[PDB]
Scaffold this motif. Structure first.
Motif, mmCIF file in Angstrom:
data_model
loop_
_atom_site.group_PDB
_atom_site.id
_atom_site.type_symbol
_atom_site.label_atom_id
_atom_site.label_comp_id
_atom_site.label_asym_id
_atom_site.label_seq_id
_atom_site.Cartn_x
_atom_site.Cartn_y
_atom_site.Cartn_z
ATOM 1 N N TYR A 1 16.970 1.619 13.797
ATOM 2 C CA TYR A 1 15.352 1.652 13.822
ATOM 3 C C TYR A 1 14.889 2.326 12.820
ATOM 4 O O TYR A 1 14.939 3.838 12.380
ATOM 5 N N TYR A 2 14.348 1.678 11.756
ATOM 6 C CA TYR A 2 13.513 2.174 10.515
ATOM 7 C C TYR A 2 12.341 2.548 10.764
ATOM 8 O O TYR A 2 11.681 1.654 11.118
ATOM 9 N N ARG A 3 11.678 3.643 10.222
ATOM 10 C CA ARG A 3 10.478 4.219 10.135
ATOM 11 C C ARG A 3 9.954 4.154 8.561
ATOM 12 O O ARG A 3 10.488 5.145 8.007
ATOM 13 N N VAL A 4 9.469 3.113 8.239
ATOM 14 C CA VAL A 4 8.988 2.988 6.758
ATOM 15 C C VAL A 4 7.477 3.514 6.725
ATOM 16 O O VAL A 4 6.797 2.865 7.239
ATOM 17 N N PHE A 5 7.421 4.856 6.187
ATOM 18 C CA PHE A 5 6.059 5.316 6.152
ATOM 19 C C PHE A 5 5.089 4.460 4.939
ATOM 20 O O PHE A 5 5.370 3.889 4.050
ATOM 21 N N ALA A 6 3.698 4.975 5.361
ATOM 22 C CA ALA A 6 3.051 4.151 4.223
ATOM 23 C C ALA A 6 3.040 5.056 2.967
ATOM 24 O O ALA A 6 3.641 6.011 2.801
ATOM 25 N N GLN A 7 2.490 4.308 1.960
ATOM 26 C CA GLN A 7 2.640 4.706 0.343
ATOM 27 C C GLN A 7 1.379 5.002 0.102
ATOM 28 O O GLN A 7 0.474 4.287 -0.304
ATOM 29 N N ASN A 8 0.798 6.182 -0.199
ATOM 30 C CA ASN A 8 -0.353 6.934 -0.766
ATOM 31 C C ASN A 8 -0.656 7.341 -2.036
ATOM 32 O O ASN A 8 -1.618 7.281 -2.573
ATOM 33 N N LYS A 9 0.799 7.483 -2.713
ATOM 34 C CA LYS A 9 0.727 8.050 -3.997
ATOM 35 C C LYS A 9 0.600 6.759 -4.862
ATOM 36 O O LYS A 9 1.731 6.198 -5.301
ATOM 37 N N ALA B 1 -0.271 4.374 -8.102
ATOM 38 C CA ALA B 1 -0.401 4.271 -9.622
ATOM 39 C C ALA B 1 -1.661 3.694 -10.076
ATOM 40 O O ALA B 1 -2.645 3.555 -9.313
ATOM 41 N N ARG B 2 -2.057 3.476 -11.310
ATOM 42 C CA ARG B 2 -3.272 3.282 -11.859
ATOM 43 C C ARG B 2 -4.178 2.077 -11.284
ATOM 44 O O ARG B 2 -5.188 2.198 -10.745
ATOM 45 N N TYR B 3 -3.326 0.885 -10.904
ATOM 46 C CA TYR B 3 -3.987 -0.161 -10.311
ATOM 47 C C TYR B 3 -3.563 -0.503 -8.866
ATOM 48 O O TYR B 3 -3.852 -1.588 -8.316
ATOM 49 N N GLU B 4 -2.554 0.249 -8.343
ATOM 50 C CA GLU B 4 -2.116 -0.004 -7.121
ATOM 51 C C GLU B 4 -2.834 0.204 -5.867
ATOM 52 O O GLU B 4 -3.993 0.867 -5.894
ATOM 53 N N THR B 5 -2.553 -0.619 -4.889
ATOM 54 C CA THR B 5 -3.332 -0.391 -3.494
ATOM 55 C C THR B 5 -2.247 0.124 -2.455
ATOM 56 O O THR B 5 -1.039 0.117 -2.820
ATOM 57 N N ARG B 6 -2.859 0.992 -1.569
ATOM 58 C CA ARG B 6 -2.317 1.338 -0.643
ATOM 59 C C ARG B 6 -1.123 0.336 0.210
ATOM 60 O O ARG B 6 -1.318 -0.793 0.177
ATOM 61 N N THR B 7 0.078 0.852 0.656
ATOM 62 C CA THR B 7 0.855 0.072 1.049
ATOM 63 C C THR B 7 1.330 0.599 2.617
ATOM 64 O O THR B 7 1.741 1.832 2.387
ATOM 65 N N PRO B 8 1.209 -0.057 3.480
ATOM 66 C CA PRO B 8 1.766 0.505 4.919
ATOM 67 C C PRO B 8 3.017 -0.056 4.866
ATOM 68 O O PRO B 8 3.471 -0.949 4.043
ATOM 69 N N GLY B 9 4.124 0.588 5.699
ATOM 70 C CA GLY B 9 3.861 1.400 6.906
ATOM 71 C C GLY B 9 4.276 0.561 8.146
ATOM 72 O O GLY B 9 3.391 -0.144 8.692
ATOM 73 N N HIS B 10 5.422 0.260 8.435
ATOM 74 C CA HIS B 10 6.012 -0.576 9.250
ATOM 75 C C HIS B 10 7.094 0.200 10.189
ATOM 76 O O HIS B 10 7.789 1.016 9.743
ATOM 77 N N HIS B 11 7.476 -0.484 11.392
ATOM 78 C CA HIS B 11 8.645 -0.062 12.002
ATOM 79 C C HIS B 11 9.762 -1.291 12.202
ATOM 80 O O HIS B 11 9.637 -2.441 12.686
ATOM 81 N N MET B 12 10.840 -1.069 11.537
ATOM 82 C CA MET B 12 11.816 -2.130 11.348
ATOM 83 C C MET B 12 12.828 -1.884 12.538
ATOM 84 O O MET B 12 13.701 -0.968 12.608
ATOM 85 N N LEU B 13 12.893 -2.823 13.661
ATOM 86 C CA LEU B 13 14.061 -2.625 14.612
ATOM 87 C C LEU B 13 15.049 -3.668 14.354
ATOM 88 O O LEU B 13 14.670 -5.012 14.711
ATOM 89 N N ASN B 14 16.457 -3.332 14.432
ATOM 90 C CA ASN B 14 17.449 -4.394 14.322
ATOM 91 C C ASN B 14 18.609 -4.081 15.228
ATOM 92 O O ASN B 14 19.045 -2.889 15.502
ATOM 93 N N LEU B 15 18.936 -5.216 15.858
ATOM 94 C CA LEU B 15 19.971 -4.964 16.932
ATOM 95 C C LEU B 15 21.138 -5.755 16.353
ATOM 96 O O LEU B 15 21.156 -6.622 15.561
ATOM 97 N N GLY B 16 22.356 -5.512 16.791
ATOM 98 C CA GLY B 16 23.638 -6.196 16.355
ATOM 99 C C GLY B 16 24.764 -6.054 17.232
ATOM 100 O O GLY B 16 24.945 -5.231 17.921
#
Ligand SMILES: CCCCCCCCOCCOCCOCCOCCO
Ligand SMILES: CCCCCCCCOCCOCCOCCOCCO
Ligand SMILES: CCCCCCCCOCCOCCOCCOCCO
Ligand SMILES: CCCCCCCCOCCOCCOCCOCCO
Ligand SMILES: CCCCCCCCOCCOCCOCCOCCO
Ligand SMILES: [Zn+2]
Length: 706
Positions: free
Chosen positions: A630-638, A640-655
């Protein structure tokens, strides 16, 4: 035995070094950046199914170094993440991710990681039973991937071995969640096939051998609007174009006084599916004997010639021709120990003839990169001293670079006439000197503590120097800076590692300080009417220089309550900042006074977001090996100049995997389930930050060693 890195003739070893098994990789995504995504401090710069580059501790391209079995890949992935990296992790024995003075053996400016992919191309030993190899196959849903692979090693007698290997992958557009009206992401399909044939000697004392490889990739370019197809950039003063005149044919010779700072930008005024057709042909020779001549313990040589090219196409029509012919030679010898200090010294010659040219519409001559010849004469080496439980290794590299361009002198004199003195036209020569120093304390073994530092100089690339063209896939028009300085870096990292039956962990803290950091400077902003109206619009950039400051942390920690079970937590975090930006001339006033406007410090573009990992693994038993990630990828609010906010998701992998044996060989079955939550996965560190990644996928696969 145990996994040991091969990238250095002399084995250096920090606690943050990481060796990925090929056996593990047979069950991983095919492209390097995808395969490595999820290793602490490693994210991906994906670009459809066709390409992904590793982003390591916030760094990529020329600030890391990907190696094809000690050799230059020869590709053009440094140019743009548009372009696939020429290694095959699914056919690899090992991927070694190394830090420290070893990086100085291969390049100057690598501050984050050396990634060496080792292959079976040239056998090095002799196969048990006279023959050996494997066969592999897997399918993936919503991918819709079919992947078949195989390899063989056959003894031709007592000391001769032939090797063959190959792979074919076919995948369509990948499914995406909630990207409405669309079931799959258009133009994200990717097909690839590779083959290799090798032939080698046997030792002792070692081996000599050769191999030929051939690779064809065909894949779509996702999110590719043609709107800039009929567009060109105005960037040089009209007056300068009229007087210098050489700037019409050779615009890379421009200086600061030629840049139109008033109204630079794009002037606008092939209805086919966007895709890339790439062909790489490789001829190499490897050698390594174990007592060359007196005073030295080992000798390893390597010769390589690589033919790389790719067409950026619309339907059956080519829009851009990319070409890169590479020849590389390296000789390394490891001296016999003098007094508990060991060492490997080497020399390298590297020639790269490259171009990136548009199809001759023409629509006026603005070459993304005109044909150029870069030569690298490099002297390098590492030395490690041993005080028992403490090792200390130093490294050096001095490489001289000569960048030459074949002018038509000819036309230039005639076309210029007078009155104007012509620019230098000479070969661009620079020389990088880099050093590294590292200390390892195995206190209370097995308990490793590394402290590593380096001061490195990176030579500007011809792309950075001489670009003057449009590259739609990166949404930029790139202008080079002919007199850039060397990127200077002061790098520090501390790594701590433990493994003790019940607990295992790896922790790292790093800081990278530049140092005339080379960055893309947007000019077509806040000026004349050609300046951009929207953030998403195409940027007209010129390469410039400033300070930069990256720092971050990454780690993993595992606990085994029972030899059956393993629980784990992983994580990473990285900050990147542009500092000391240069002031740029603004609009010319009504009085004719053009002022230098100061720009504040700001964030680095496409820096990865923080990530936390939770992990479970369990053999149950002897054959079955379930796992949960289970990966918790946090949003990115830092931003750069022309960038927009990026979410931010929950990665669930079974194997799960089924290990089962028989006559001849081993049967490794596996079943994988990715993104069960069907989440909207966005990678801030990719050029397609706001385009969703694969929605949710089932994988079934088999590998058969023998
Ligand atoms: C050694 C070659 C044999 C490979 C055949 C594999 C057996 C099944 O593969 C069929 C490949 O093509 C099927 C078409 O679709 C590919 C993915 O499937 C999605 C269809 O639901
Ligand atoms: C044993 C199963 C292996 C099946 C994988 C197929 C491997 C075949 O590819 C190797 C041959 O490829 C040569 C390189 O690719 C061709 C590129 O140039 C020609 C255009 O396709
Ligand atoms: C050094 C890691 C192991 C800690 C045990 C102490 C080692 C005793 O000597 C310390 C000197 O170590 C040199 C480490 O390399 C330099 C790192 O920093 C360079 C900054 O200029
Ligand atoms: C050359 C072998 C020893 C390597 C250490 C060289 C110096 C590298 O410093 C490591 C620590 O990093 C920050 C050092 O800061 C001093 C100057 O930093 C500002 C540079 O912009
Ligand atoms: C071994 C696990 C301990 C973590 C090792 C270092 C990895 C760093 O992980 C921290 C992740 O933290 C989440 C950060 O939160 C979002 C970032 O943005 C917050 C800034 O406002
Ligand atoms: Zn491209």
């Amino acid at each position: 035995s145990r996994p040991r890195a091969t990238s250095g003739l002399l084995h250096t070893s920090t606690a943050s070094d990481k060796i990925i098994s090929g056996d593990t990789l047979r069950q991983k995504a095919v492209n390097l950046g995808d395969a490595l995504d999820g290793v602490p401090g490693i994210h991906a710069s994906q670009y459809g199914g066709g390409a992904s580059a590793p982003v390591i501790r916030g760094q990529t391209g020329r600030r890391i170094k990907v190696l094809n079995h000690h050799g230059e890949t020869g590709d053009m992935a440094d140019f743009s993440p548009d372009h696939a990296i020429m290694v095959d992790t699914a056919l690899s024995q090992q991927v070694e991710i190394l830090r420290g003075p070893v990086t100085l053996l291969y390049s100057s400016g690598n501050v984050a990681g050396l990634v060496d992919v080792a292959d079976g191309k040239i056998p090095e030993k002799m196969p048990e039973n006279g023959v050996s190899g494997e066969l592999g196959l897997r399918l993936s849903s919503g991918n819709l991937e079919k992947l078949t692979s195989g390899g063989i090693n056959i003894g031709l007698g007592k000391n001769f071995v032939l090797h063959t290997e190959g792979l074919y992958r076919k995948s369509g557009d990948y499914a995406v969640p909630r990207y409405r009206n669309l079931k799959r992401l258009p133009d994200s399909h990717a097909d690839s096939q590779t083959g290799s044939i090798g032939l080698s000697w046997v030792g002792e004392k070692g081996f000599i051998g050769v191999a030929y490889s051939d690779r064809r990739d065909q894949y779509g370019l996702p999110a590719h609007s043609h709107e800039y197809d009929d567009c060109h950039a105005d960037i040089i003063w009209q007056k300068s174009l009229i007087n210098k005149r050489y700037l019409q044919l050779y615009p890379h010779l421009l200086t600061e006084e030629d840049i139109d700072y008033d109204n630079p930008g794009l002037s606008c005024g092939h209805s086919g599916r966007p895709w890339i057709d790439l062909r790489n042909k490789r001829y190499e020779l490897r050698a390594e004997w174990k007592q060359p001549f007196p005073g030295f313990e080992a000798l390893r040589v390597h010769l390589n010639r690589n033919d790389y090219r790719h067409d950026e196409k619309a339907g059956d029509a080519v829009e851009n021709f990319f070409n890169n012919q590479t020849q590389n030679a390296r000789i390394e010898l490891r001296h016999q120990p003098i007094g508990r200090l060991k060492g490997s010294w080497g020399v390298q010659y590297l020639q790269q003839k490259s171009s990136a040219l548009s199809a001759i519409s023409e629509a006026v001559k603005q070459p993304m990169l005109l044909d150029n010849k870069v030569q690298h004469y490099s002297f390098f080496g590492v030395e490690q001293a041993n005080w028992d439980n403490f090792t200390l290794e130093g490294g050096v590299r001095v490489e001289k670079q000569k960048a030459s361009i074949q002018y038509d002198k000819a036309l230039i004199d005639r076309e210029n006439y007078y009155n104007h003195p012509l620019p230098d036209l000479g070969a661009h020569r620079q020389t990088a000197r880099s050093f590294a120093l590292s200390g390892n304390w195995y206190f209370t073994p097995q308990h490793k503590l590394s402290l590593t530092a380096s001061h490195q100089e990176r030579l500007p690339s011809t792309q950075e120097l001489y670009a003057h063209g449009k590259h739609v896939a990166t949404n930029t028009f790139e202008v080079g800076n002919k007199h850039l300085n060397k990127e200077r870096s002061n790098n520090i990292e501390l790594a701590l590692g433990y493994e003790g039956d019940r607990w295992q962990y790896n922790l790292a803290l790093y800081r990278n300080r530049f140092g005339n950091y080379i960055y893309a400077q947007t000019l077509n902003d806040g000026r004349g009417p050609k300046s951009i109206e929207d953030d998403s619009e195409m940027k007209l950039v010129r390469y410039n220089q400033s300070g930069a400051d990256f720092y971050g942390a990454e780690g993993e920690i595992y606990f085994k309550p029972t030899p059956r079970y393993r629980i784990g937590v992983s994580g990473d975090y990285v900050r990147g900042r542009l500092k000391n930006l240069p002031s740029l001339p603004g609009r010319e006033d009504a009085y004719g006074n053009r002022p230098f406007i100061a720009q504040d410090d700001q964030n680095a573009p496409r820096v990865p977001a923080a990530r936390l990992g939770f992990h479970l693994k369990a053999s149950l038993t002897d054959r079955i090996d379930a796992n949960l990630d289970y990966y918790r990828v946090f949003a990115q609010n830092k931003l750069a100049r022309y960038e927009t906010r990026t979410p931010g998701h929950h990665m669930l992998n079974l194997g799960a995997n089924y290990r089962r044996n028989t006559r001849y060989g081993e049967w490794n079955w596996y079943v994988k389930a990715d993104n069960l939550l069907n989440q909207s996965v966005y990678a801030h560190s990719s050029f397609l930050s706001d385009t969703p990644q694969m929605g949710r996928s089932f994988t079934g696969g088999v590998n058969v060693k023998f």
